[PDB]
């Protein structure tokens with residue numbers, strides 16, 4: 001689970017925060033990425049930790 | 050939920066496939082066919098057309 | 100029709116704080132790349148807001 005600002009970082013040949021320090025994809029990747037919104041499942045009015 | 054549209058949660062599932070590496074273990078839905086020889090046909094061996 | 104232009108100069112530009120400032124989706128560029136903006140540098144920056 002990530003935020004909307006870093007969905008484009010889940011790609012080959014990209015740097016940043018998620019793509020470089022948490023989850024790095026190889027340059028010769030052969031696969032498919034599926035991302036969808038989860039505001040009704042993983043959100044709380046008090047904040048999520 | 051009050052936050053902006055660029056800061057919403059997003060569930061990500063990433064599927065990675067390995068191919069042309071080993072004898073095949075997982076394969077998609079396609080029925081088999083009996084084998085003939087000594088005649089040129091349109092073969093299909095685990096997704097290799099020809 | 101009266102868009103505001105701000106001249107950004109004589110400072111150190113960090114582009115990693117733009118995502119925290121505004122909840123947008125895509126940092127769409129045309130001449131450069133979003134991930135390479137902290138390495139190289141320019142003469143002047145102009146920000147046009149509307």
Ligand SMILES: *[C@@H]1O[C@H](CO)[C@@H](O)[C@H](O)[C@H]1NC(C)=O
Nearest residue numbers: 053116117118119120121122
């Ligand atoms: C925007 O500026 C206002 C006024 O200082 C401040 O209250 C608010 O927290 C700022 N928002 C962001 C995202 O910086």
